[model samples]
Target chain A: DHVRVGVVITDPALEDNPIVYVNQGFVQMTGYETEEILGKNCRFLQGKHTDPAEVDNIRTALQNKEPVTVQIQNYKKDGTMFWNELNIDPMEIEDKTYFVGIQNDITKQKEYEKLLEDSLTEITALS
Target chain B: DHVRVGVVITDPALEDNPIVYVNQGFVQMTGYETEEILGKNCRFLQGKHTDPAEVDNIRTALQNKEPVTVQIQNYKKDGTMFWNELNIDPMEIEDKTYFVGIQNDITKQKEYEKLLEDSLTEITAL
Candidate 1:
Protein backbone atom coordinates (compact mmCIF):
# COMPACT_ATOMS: atom_id res chain seq x y z
CA ASP A 1 0.00 0.00 0.00
CA HIS A 2 1.26 3.46 -0.91
CA VAL A 3 1.84 5.64 2.20
CA ARG A 4 -0.52 8.43 1.20
CA VAL A 5 -0.64 11.08 3.92
CA GLY A 6 -4.40 11.73 3.93
CA VAL A 7 -6.60 9.44 6.07
CA VAL A 8 -10.24 9.29 7.12
CA ILE A 9 -10.98 8.78 10.81
CA THR A 10 -14.22 6.77 10.96
CA ASP A 11 -14.98 6.03 14.59
CA PRO A 12 -18.32 6.25 16.38
CA ALA A 13 -16.70 8.43 19.01
CA LEU A 14 -16.19 11.05 16.29
CA GLU A 15 -19.35 10.10 14.41
CA ASP A 16 -21.02 13.46 15.20
CA ASN A 17 -17.80 15.30 14.34
CA PRO A 18 -16.32 12.76 11.89
CA ILE A 19 -13.48 14.15 9.82
CA VAL A 20 -13.86 12.38 6.48
CA TYR A 21 -10.24 12.98 5.44
CA VAL A 22 -7.52 15.58 5.30
CA ASN A 23 -5.20 16.54 2.45
CA GLN A 24 -1.43 16.95 2.04
CA GLY A 25 -1.90 20.69 2.61
CA PHE A 26 -3.58 19.97 5.93
CA VAL A 27 -0.66 17.84 7.14
CA GLN A 28 1.86 20.46 6.02
CA MET A 29 -0.13 23.25 7.67
CA THR A 30 -0.67 21.52 11.05
CA GLY A 31 2.78 19.84 11.29
CA TYR A 32 1.18 16.48 11.99
CA GLU A 33 1.92 13.55 9.70
CA THR A 34 -0.98 11.45 8.43
CA GLU A 35 -0.29 8.42 10.60
CA GLU A 36 0.25 10.55 13.71
CA ILE A 37 -3.04 12.35 13.18
CA LEU A 38 -5.19 9.39 12.22
CA GLY A 39 -7.42 7.83 14.94
CA LYS A 40 -6.51 10.78 17.19
CA ASN A 41 -9.00 13.38 18.29
CA CYS A 42 -9.18 16.57 16.16
CA ARG A 43 -9.47 18.42 19.48
CA PHE A 44 -5.69 18.03 19.78
CA LEU A 45 -5.49 21.18 17.65
CA GLN A 46 -7.76 23.03 20.05
CA GLY A 47 -5.55 24.85 22.57
CA LYS A 48 -5.90 27.42 25.36
CA HIS A 49 -6.03 30.18 22.74
CA THR A 50 -8.88 28.42 20.92
CA ASP A 51 -12.01 30.47 21.66
CA PRO A 52 -14.62 28.48 23.60
CA ALA A 53 -17.35 30.63 22.05
CA GLU A 54 -16.22 29.62 18.59
CA VAL A 55 -15.97 25.96 19.63
CA ASP A 56 -19.44 26.10 21.17
CA ASN A 57 -20.82 27.60 17.98
CA ILE A 58 -19.24 24.81 15.95
CA ARG A 59 -20.57 22.16 18.31
CA THR A 60 -24.07 23.61 18.11
CA ALA A 61 -23.91 23.71 14.33
CA LEU A 62 -22.74 20.11 14.23
CA GLN A 63 -25.58 18.94 16.52
CA ASN A 64 -28.09 20.72 14.34
CA LYS A 65 -26.49 19.17 11.19
CA GLU A 66 -25.68 22.66 9.80
CA PRO A 67 -22.60 24.04 8.05
CA VAL A 68 -20.54 26.71 9.83
CA THR A 69 -17.66 29.07 9.06
CA VAL A 70 -15.26 29.92 11.87
CA GLN A 71 -12.00 31.80 12.20
CA ILE A 72 -9.74 29.87 14.57
CA GLN A 73 -6.29 30.65 15.95
CA ASN A 74 -4.22 27.47 15.43
CA TYR A 75 -0.55 26.74 16.12
CA LYS A 76 2.07 24.93 14.06
CA LYS A 77 4.75 22.38 15.08
CA ASP A 78 7.06 25.26 16.05
CA GLY A 79 4.17 26.94 17.89
CA THR A 80 3.84 29.73 15.34
CA MET A 81 0.37 31.27 15.24
CA PHE A 82 -1.79 31.47 12.13
CA TRP A 83 -5.43 32.16 11.36
CA ASN A 84 -7.61 29.47 9.80
CA GLU A 85 -10.88 30.39 8.12
CA LEU A 86 -12.40 26.97 8.59
CA ASN A 87 -15.38 26.21 6.36
CA ILE A 88 -17.07 23.07 7.65
CA ASP A 89 -19.73 21.31 5.65
CA PRO A 90 -21.45 17.98 6.33
CA MET A 91 -21.82 15.02 3.97
CA GLU A 92 -24.09 12.01 4.32
CA ILE A 93 -23.70 8.60 2.71
CA GLU A 94 -26.01 5.65 3.52
CA ASP A 95 -27.33 7.37 6.69
CA LYS A 96 -23.79 8.11 7.87
CA THR A 97 -22.43 11.63 8.51
CA TYR A 98 -18.96 13.07 7.77
CA PHE A 99 -17.42 16.56 7.80
CA VAL A 100 -14.82 18.35 5.66
CA GLY A 101 -12.57 21.08 7.00
CA ILE A 102 -11.10 23.59 4.54
CA GLN A 103 -8.45 25.90 5.95
CA ASN A 104 -7.04 29.14 4.47
CA ASP A 105 -4.13 31.39 5.58
CA ILE A 106 -5.17 35.06 5.82
CA THR A 107 -2.35 36.32 8.05
CA LYS A 108 -0.39 38.57 5.70
CA GLN A 109 -3.29 40.61 4.37
CA LYS A 110 -4.79 40.85 7.84
CA GLU A 111 -1.51 42.04 9.37
CA TYR A 112 -0.76 44.56 6.63
CA GLU A 113 -4.08 46.34 7.14
CA LYS A 114 -3.61 46.34 10.90
CA LEU A 115 -0.17 47.90 10.77
CA LEU A 116 -1.44 50.53 8.34
CA GLU A 117 -4.21 51.47 10.78
CA ASP A 118 -1.93 51.64 13.84
CA SER A 119 0.48 53.78 11.84
CA LEU A 120 -2.39 56.08 10.99
CA THR A 121 -3.38 56.43 14.63
CA GLU A 122 0.18 57.09 15.76
CA ILE A 123 0.67 59.70 13.02
CA THR A 124 -2.59 61.41 13.91
CA ALA A 125 -1.66 61.56 17.59
CA LEU A 126 1.68 63.20 16.84
CA SER A 127 0.17 65.76 14.45
CA ASP B 1 -31.93 81.70 8.35
CA HIS B 2 -31.30 78.49 10.29
CA VAL B 3 -27.83 76.91 10.69
CA ARG B 4 -28.17 73.21 9.93
CA VAL B 5 -24.35 72.71 9.72
CA GLY B 6 -24.44 70.65 6.49
CA VAL B 7 -23.76 72.42 3.21
CA VAL B 8 -22.71 71.62 -0.37
CA ILE B 9 -19.47 73.11 -1.72
CA THR B 10 -19.92 74.11 -5.35
CA ASP B 11 -17.10 75.84 -7.22
CA PRO B 12 -15.40 75.62 -10.63
CA ALA B 13 -12.01 75.35 -8.90
CA LEU B 14 -13.38 72.02 -7.70
CA GLU B 15 -15.31 71.37 -10.90
CA ASP B 16 -13.64 68.04 -11.44
CA ASN B 17 -13.54 67.43 -7.67
CA PRO B 18 -16.68 69.23 -6.58
CA ILE B 19 -18.10 67.92 -3.32
CA VAL B 20 -21.85 67.97 -4.06
CA TYR B 21 -22.66 68.02 -0.38
CA VAL B 22 -21.93 66.40 2.97
CA ASN B 23 -24.38 65.42 5.70
CA GLN B 24 -24.26 65.69 9.51
CA GLY B 25 -22.61 62.25 9.64
CA PHE B 26 -19.81 63.47 7.41
CA VAL B 27 -19.28 66.54 9.57
CA GLN B 28 -19.20 64.39 12.73
CA MET B 29 -16.79 61.89 11.21
CA THR B 30 -14.33 64.48 9.81
CA GLY B 31 -14.60 66.90 12.76
CA TYR B 32 -15.40 69.78 10.41
CA GLU B 33 -18.48 71.91 10.74
CA THR B 34 -20.50 72.78 7.63
CA GLU B 35 -19.68 76.50 7.90
CA GLU B 36 -15.92 75.94 8.22
CA ILE B 37 -15.78 73.21 5.55
CA LEU B 38 -17.95 74.72 2.84
CA GLY B 39 -16.06 76.05 -0.22
CA LYS B 40 -12.79 74.78 1.37
CA ASN B 41 -10.51 72.46 -0.56
CA CYS B 42 -11.13 68.76 0.04
CA ARG B 43 -7.38 68.34 -0.32
CA PHE B 44 -7.13 70.13 3.06
CA LEU B 45 -7.87 66.70 4.53
CA GLN B 46 -4.91 65.08 2.72
CA GLY B 47 -1.62 64.86 4.60
CA LYS B 48 1.77 63.10 4.55
CA HIS B 49 0.24 59.71 5.27
CA THR B 50 -2.32 60.19 2.51
CA ASP B 51 -0.89 58.10 -0.29
CA PRO B 52 0.13 60.19 -3.30
CA ALA B 53 -0.36 57.14 -5.50
CA GLU B 54 -3.98 56.98 -4.41
CA VAL B 55 -4.39 60.70 -5.01
CA ASP B 56 -2.89 60.38 -8.51
CA ASN B 57 -5.21 57.49 -9.26
CA ILE B 58 -8.16 59.62 -8.19
CA ARG B 59 -6.95 62.55 -10.34
CA THR B 60 -6.60 60.28 -13.37
CA ALA B 61 -10.05 58.86 -12.84
CA LEU B 62 -11.49 62.37 -12.72
CA GLN B 63 -9.60 63.45 -15.86
CA ASN B 64 -10.92 60.45 -17.72
CA LYS B 65 -14.44 61.15 -16.43
CA GLU B 66 -14.62 57.84 -14.59
CA PRO B 67 -15.70 56.86 -11.09
CA VAL B 68 -13.07 55.55 -8.67
CA THR B 69 -13.20 53.81 -5.32
CA VAL B 70 -10.25 54.60 -3.03
CA GLN B 71 -9.31 53.71 0.54
CA ILE B 72 -7.81 56.85 2.04
CA GLN B 73 -6.24 57.50 5.44
CA ASN B 74 -7.74 60.87 6.35
CA TYR B 75 -7.43 63.03 9.48
CA LYS B 76 -9.98 64.82 11.61
CA LYS B 77 -10.07 68.35 13.13
CA ASP B 78 -8.27 67.23 16.31
CA GLY B 79 -5.79 65.30 14.08
CA THR B 80 -7.27 61.91 14.92
CA MET B 81 -7.04 59.20 12.24
CA PHE B 82 -9.69 57.07 10.55
CA TRP B 83 -9.91 55.00 7.40
CA ASN B 84 -12.47 55.98 4.81
CA GLU B 85 -13.63 53.90 1.87
CA LEU B 86 -14.39 56.82 -0.49
CA ASN B 87 -16.65 56.15 -3.44
CA ILE B 88 -16.39 59.02 -5.94
CA ASP B 89 -18.78 59.44 -8.82
CA PRO B 90 -19.12 62.33 -11.27
CA MET B 91 -22.44 64.06 -11.84
CA GLU B 92 -23.17 66.67 -14.52
CA ILE B 93 -26.12 68.99 -14.45
CA GLU B 94 -26.77 72.17 -16.55
CA ASP B 95 -23.31 71.87 -18.16
CA LYS B 96 -21.49 71.63 -14.81
CA THR B 97 -19.45 68.87 -13.19
CA TYR B 98 -19.74 67.73 -9.55
CA PHE B 99 -18.66 64.78 -7.42
CA VAL B 100 -20.13 62.86 -4.48
CA GLY B 101 -17.82 61.42 -1.81
CA ILE B 102 -19.25 58.67 0.37
CA GLN B 103 -17.16 57.75 3.42
CA ASN B 104 -17.43 54.63 5.58
CA ASP B 105 -15.59 53.73 8.84
CA ILE B 106 -13.92 50.29 8.92
CA THR B 107 -11.52 50.86 11.83
CA LYS B 108 -13.30 48.91 14.61
CA GLN B 109 -13.67 45.62 12.72
CA LYS B 110 -10.14 45.96 11.37
CA GLU B 111 -8.56 46.53 14.80
CA TYR B 112 -10.52 43.75 16.56
CA GLU B 113 -9.26 41.09 14.13
CA LYS B 114 -5.67 42.33 14.50
CA LEU B 115 -5.82 42.16 18.29
CA LEU B 116 -7.12 38.61 18.07
CA GLU B 117 -4.22 37.57 15.81
CA ASP B 118 -1.60 39.22 18.01
CA SER B 119 -3.03 37.54 21.09
CA LEU B 120 -2.84 34.23 19.23
CA THR B 121 0.84 34.80 18.48
CA GLU B 122 1.65 35.67 22.07
CA ILE B 123 -0.06 32.48 23.26
CA THR B 124 1.83 30.38 20.69
CA ALA B 125 5.15 31.94 21.76
CA LEU B 126 4.57 30.82 25.37
Candidate 2:
Protein backbone atom coordinates (compact mmCIF):
# COMPACT_ATOMS: atom_id res chain seq x y z
CA ASP A 1 0.00 0.00 0.00
CA HIS A 2 2.96 2.24 0.60
CA VAL A 3 4.20 1.84 -2.96
CA ARG A 4 2.85 4.11 -5.65
CA VAL A 5 4.36 3.02 -8.92
CA GLY A 6 2.98 4.42 -12.15
CA VAL A 7 3.27 2.81 -15.54
CA VAL A 8 3.04 4.59 -18.88
CA ILE A 9 3.04 2.85 -22.22
CA THR A 10 4.02 4.81 -25.31
CA ASP A 11 4.15 3.80 -28.93
CA PRO A 12 7.54 5.04 -29.97
CA ALA A 13 6.74 4.12 -33.56
CA LEU A 14 4.15 6.84 -33.52
CA GLU A 15 5.08 10.47 -33.90
CA ASP A 16 6.72 11.72 -30.70
CA ASN A 17 5.91 8.42 -28.95
CA PRO A 18 2.65 9.68 -27.61
CA ILE A 19 1.33 8.10 -24.45
CA VAL A 20 -1.12 5.38 -25.38
CA TYR A 21 -1.91 4.15 -21.91
CA VAL A 22 -1.43 5.23 -18.33
CA ASN A 23 -2.31 3.28 -15.24
CA GLN A 24 -4.68 4.64 -12.61
CA GLY A 25 -1.74 5.09 -10.27
CA PHE A 26 -0.38 7.69 -12.62
CA VAL A 27 -3.76 9.39 -12.80
CA GLN A 28 -3.87 9.60 -9.02
CA MET A 29 -0.36 10.97 -8.71
CA THR A 30 -0.31 13.45 -11.61
CA GLY A 31 -3.93 14.67 -11.27
CA TYR A 32 -4.46 14.25 -15.03
CA GLU A 33 -7.62 12.92 -16.54
CA THR A 34 -7.17 9.82 -18.65
CA GLU A 35 -8.95 11.33 -21.62
CA GLU A 36 -6.88 14.48 -21.45
CA ILE A 37 -3.61 12.54 -21.51
CA LEU A 38 -4.23 10.14 -24.36
CA GLY A 39 -2.92 10.93 -27.84
CA LYS A 40 -0.64 13.56 -26.37
CA ASN A 41 3.11 13.38 -26.10
CA CYS A 42 4.36 12.78 -22.57
CA ARG A 43 6.36 15.91 -23.07
CA PHE A 44 3.13 17.84 -22.69
CA LEU A 45 3.69 17.42 -18.98
CA GLN A 46 7.04 19.12 -19.34
CA GLY A 47 6.96 22.74 -18.32
CA LYS A 48 9.38 25.66 -18.35
CA HIS A 49 10.29 24.75 -14.79
CA THR A 50 11.32 21.27 -15.90
CA ASP A 51 15.02 20.82 -16.42
CA PRO A 52 15.99 20.75 -20.07
CA ALA A 53 19.00 18.50 -19.54
CA GLU A 54 16.88 15.74 -17.98
CA VAL A 55 14.41 15.99 -20.86
CA ASP A 56 17.28 15.70 -23.31
CA ASN A 57 18.46 12.54 -21.59
CA ILE A 58 15.05 10.95 -22.08
CA ARG A 59 14.93 11.98 -25.73
CA THR A 60 18.38 10.59 -26.36
CA ALA A 61 17.44 7.28 -24.80
CA LEU A 62 14.36 7.03 -26.97
CA GLN A 63 16.31 7.86 -30.12
CA ASN A 64 18.85 5.19 -29.34
CA LYS A 65 16.18 2.67 -28.25
CA GLU A 66 18.11 2.23 -25.00
CA PRO A 67 16.79 1.94 -21.47
CA VAL A 68 17.43 4.83 -19.10
CA THR A 69 16.56 5.82 -15.55
CA VAL A 70 16.24 9.52 -14.84
CA GLN A 71 15.00 11.71 -12.04
CA ILE A 72 13.12 14.70 -13.42
CA GLN A 73 10.97 17.53 -12.19
CA ASN A 74 7.44 17.42 -13.64
CA TYR A 75 4.39 19.61 -13.26
CA LYS A 76 1.13 18.00 -12.35
CA LYS A 77 -2.21 19.16 -13.70
CA ASP A 78 -2.50 21.33 -10.62
CA GLY A 79 0.74 23.09 -11.63
CA THR A 80 2.48 21.62 -8.62
CA MET A 81 5.94 20.25 -9.41
CA PHE A 82 7.34 17.01 -8.05
CA TRP A 83 10.37 14.83 -8.54
CA ASN A 84 9.69 11.90 -10.84
CA GLU A 85 12.14 9.09 -11.05
CA LEU A 86 11.32 7.09 -14.14
CA ASN A 87 12.74 3.85 -15.43
CA ILE A 88 12.33 3.69 -19.19
CA ASP A 89 12.26 0.18 -20.58
CA PRO A 90 12.22 -0.15 -24.36
CA MET A 91 10.83 -3.18 -26.12
CA GLU A 92 10.14 -4.23 -29.70
CA ILE A 93 6.64 -5.19 -30.71
CA GLU A 94 6.87 -6.84 -34.13
CA ASP A 95 7.79 -3.93 -36.39
CA LYS A 96 7.26 -1.19 -33.84
CA THR A 97 8.92 -0.03 -30.65
CA TYR A 98 7.33 0.71 -27.30
CA PHE A 99 8.50 2.08 -23.99
CA VAL A 100 7.24 1.11 -20.56
CA GLY A 101 8.04 3.97 -18.27
CA ILE A 102 7.80 3.10 -14.61
CA GLN A 103 7.47 6.32 -12.70
CA ASN A 104 7.88 6.93 -8.97
CA ASP A 105 7.23 10.26 -7.32
CA ILE A 106 10.36 10.81 -5.25
CA THR A 107 9.68 14.29 -3.99
CA LYS A 108 10.11 13.27 -0.36
CA GLN A 109 13.35 11.50 -1.13
CA LYS A 110 14.68 14.65 -2.74
CA GLU A 111 13.60 16.69 0.24
CA TYR A 112 15.23 14.24 2.63
CA GLU A 113 18.48 14.39 0.67
CA LYS A 114 18.41 18.17 0.86
CA LEU A 115 17.80 17.98 4.60
CA LEU A 116 20.81 15.74 5.02
CA GLU A 117 22.93 18.15 3.04
CA ASP A 118 21.87 21.05 5.20
CA SER A 119 22.42 19.09 8.39
CA LEU A 120 25.89 18.15 7.26
CA THR A 121 26.72 21.80 6.61
CA GLU A 122 25.51 22.78 10.07
CA ILE A 123 27.59 20.04 11.67
CA THR A 124 30.74 20.96 9.76
CA ALA A 125 30.43 24.63 10.71
CA LEU A 126 29.91 23.80 14.38
CA SER A 127 32.62 21.13 14.50
CA ASP B 1 29.91 5.46 -16.73
CA HIS B 2 29.06 5.77 -13.08
CA VAL B 3 25.95 3.61 -12.97
CA ARG B 4 25.81 -0.15 -13.38
CA VAL B 5 22.42 -1.63 -14.10
CA GLY B 6 21.64 -5.37 -14.34
CA VAL B 7 18.59 -7.04 -15.83
CA VAL B 8 17.13 -10.49 -15.39
CA ILE B 9 14.13 -12.09 -17.06
CA THR B 10 12.16 -14.78 -15.27
CA ASP B 11 9.07 -16.79 -16.20
CA PRO B 12 6.51 -17.38 -13.48
CA ALA B 13 4.56 -19.87 -15.54
CA LEU B 14 7.54 -22.12 -15.39
CA GLU B 15 8.48 -24.16 -12.35
CA ASP B 16 9.88 -21.66 -9.76
CA ASN B 17 10.15 -18.51 -11.85
CA PRO B 18 13.55 -19.62 -12.95
CA ILE B 19 15.74 -17.06 -14.57
CA VAL B 20 15.46 -17.57 -18.29
CA TYR B 21 17.94 -14.87 -19.16
CA VAL B 22 20.42 -12.48 -17.60
CA ASN B 23 21.99 -9.64 -19.51
CA GLN B 24 25.72 -9.21 -20.02
CA GLY B 25 25.79 -6.30 -17.63
CA PHE B 26 24.41 -8.52 -14.88
CA VAL B 27 26.98 -11.17 -15.65
CA GLN B 28 29.76 -8.57 -15.52
CA MET B 29 28.56 -7.26 -12.18
CA THR B 30 27.93 -10.59 -10.45
CA GLY B 31 30.87 -12.52 -11.88
CA TYR B 32 28.60 -15.26 -13.15
CA GLU B 33 28.45 -16.74 -16.62
CA THR B 34 25.24 -16.17 -18.54
CA GLU B 35 24.81 -19.90 -19.15
CA GLU B 36 25.24 -20.59 -15.46
CA ILE B 37 22.65 -18.04 -14.47
CA LEU B 38 19.89 -18.79 -16.98
CA GLY B 39 18.65 -22.02 -15.45
CA LYS B 40 18.99 -20.76 -11.90
CA ASN B 41 16.76 -18.75 -9.63
CA CYS B 42 18.07 -15.31 -8.74
CA ARG B 43 18.42 -16.45 -5.11
CA PHE B 44 21.98 -17.46 -5.87
CA LEU B 45 22.86 -13.82 -5.48
CA GLN B 46 21.65 -13.98 -1.88
CA GLY B 47 23.88 -15.06 0.95
CA LYS B 48 23.93 -15.47 4.69
CA HIS B 49 24.63 -11.78 4.97
CA THR B 50 21.44 -10.95 3.07
CA ASP B 51 18.44 -9.77 5.05
CA PRO B 52 15.59 -12.26 4.99
CA ALA B 53 13.01 -9.47 5.27
CA GLU B 54 14.17 -7.96 2.02
CA VAL B 55 14.16 -11.34 0.32
CA ASP B 56 10.66 -11.93 1.64
CA ASN B 57 9.59 -8.65 0.15
CA ILE B 58 10.90 -9.72 -3.23
CA ARG B 59 9.23 -13.09 -2.91
CA THR B 60 5.94 -11.42 -2.05
CA ALA B 61 6.17 -9.21 -5.11
CA LEU B 62 6.86 -12.19 -7.33
CA GLN B 63 3.90 -14.03 -5.88
CA ASN B 64 1.56 -11.10 -6.32
CA LYS B 65 3.04 -10.16 -9.67
CA GLU B 66 3.40 -6.61 -8.42
CA PRO B 67 6.18 -4.13 -8.98
CA VAL B 68 8.43 -3.54 -6.02
CA THR B 69 11.61 -1.58 -5.44
CA VAL B 70 13.85 -3.03 -2.74
CA GLN B 71 17.28 -2.25 -1.41
CA ILE B 72 19.03 -5.37 -0.11
CA GLN B 73 22.42 -6.92 0.32
CA ASN B 74 23.73 -9.23 -2.41
CA TYR B 75 26.82 -11.33 -2.77
CA LYS B 76 29.10 -11.88 -5.73
CA LYS B 77 30.88 -15.07 -6.70
CA ASP B 78 33.90 -14.05 -4.65
CA GLY B 79 31.72 -13.85 -1.53
CA THR B 80 31.79 -10.07 -1.43
CA MET B 81 28.67 -8.30 -0.31
CA PHE B 82 27.24 -5.11 -1.83
CA TRP B 83 24.04 -3.16 -1.61
CA ASN B 84 21.64 -3.94 -4.44
CA GLU B 85 18.78 -1.65 -5.29
CA LEU B 86 16.43 -3.77 -7.37
CA ASN B 87 13.37 -2.62 -9.21
CA ILE B 88 11.11 -5.54 -10.01
CA ASP B 89 8.82 -5.14 -13.01
CA PRO B 90 6.11 -7.70 -13.67
CA MET B 91 4.52 -8.24 -17.06
CA GLU B 92 2.21 -10.71 -18.72
CA ILE B 93 3.02 -12.16 -22.14
CA GLU B 94 -0.08 -13.81 -23.65
CA ASP B 95 -1.21 -14.69 -20.10
CA LYS B 96 2.17 -15.88 -18.88
CA THR B 97 3.88 -13.92 -16.13
CA TYR B 98 7.35 -12.49 -16.57
CA PHE B 99 9.42 -10.26 -14.35
CA VAL B 100 12.17 -7.92 -15.46
CA GLY B 101 14.37 -7.08 -12.54
CA ILE B 102 16.58 -4.02 -12.89
CA GLN B 103 19.38 -3.87 -10.37
CA ASN B 104 21.81 -1.15 -9.41
CA ASP B 105 24.76 -1.57 -7.06
CA ILE B 106 23.97 1.19 -4.60
CA THR B 107 26.61 0.32 -2.00
CA LYS B 108 28.09 3.80 -2.21
CA GLN B 109 24.73 5.43 -1.68
CA LYS B 110 24.06 3.16 1.28
CA GLU B 111 27.43 4.14 2.75
CA TYR B 112 26.66 7.80 2.27
CA GLU B 113 23.33 7.42 4.02
CA LYS B 114 25.04 5.68 6.90
CA LEU B 115 27.53 8.51 7.12
CA LEU B 116 24.71 10.99 7.44
CA GLU B 117 23.06 8.89 10.12
CA ASP B 118 26.24 8.73 12.17
CA SER B 119 26.85 12.44 11.66
CA LEU B 120 23.36 13.19 12.91
CA THR B 121 24.08 11.25 16.09
CA GLU B 122 27.32 13.11 16.65
CA ILE B 123 25.62 16.45 16.12
CA THR B 124 22.91 15.54 18.62
CA ALA B 125 25.50 14.57 21.21
CA LEU B 126 27.37 17.82 20.78
Top model number, DockQ: 2
Count clashes in each candidate, considering only residues at least 3 apart in sequence or on different chains.
Answer: 0, 0
Best candidate (score: lDDT): 2
Which lDDT tens digits does candidate 2 get at residues A1-127?
Answer: 1235566768767787788766666788888988998778888667877898999999898889888888999888998988887778775433345677767788887898898889889989999
Point to the candidate with the largest TM-score.
Answer: 2
RMSD of candidates 1 onward, in order: 19.4, 6.3
* Interface RMS deviation of candidate 2: 5.8
Q: What fraction of the true interface does each of the listed models get right, in terms of native contacts kept? A: 0.00, 0.00
Colliding residue pairs in candidate 2: none
Candidate 1: list runs displaced more than 4 Å: A1-20, A123-127, B1-126
User: What TM-score does chain B of candidate 1 reach?
Assistant: 0.71
Task: Report the CAPRI category for model 1.
Answer: incorrect
Model 1's DockQ? 0.01
lDDT of 1 by residue, B1-126 (tens): 111112232344443443434455457767888676755657766776999999999888867868677888878888877776665555443345545455554453367667878976985697
Query: What does candidate 2 score on TM?
Result: 0.56
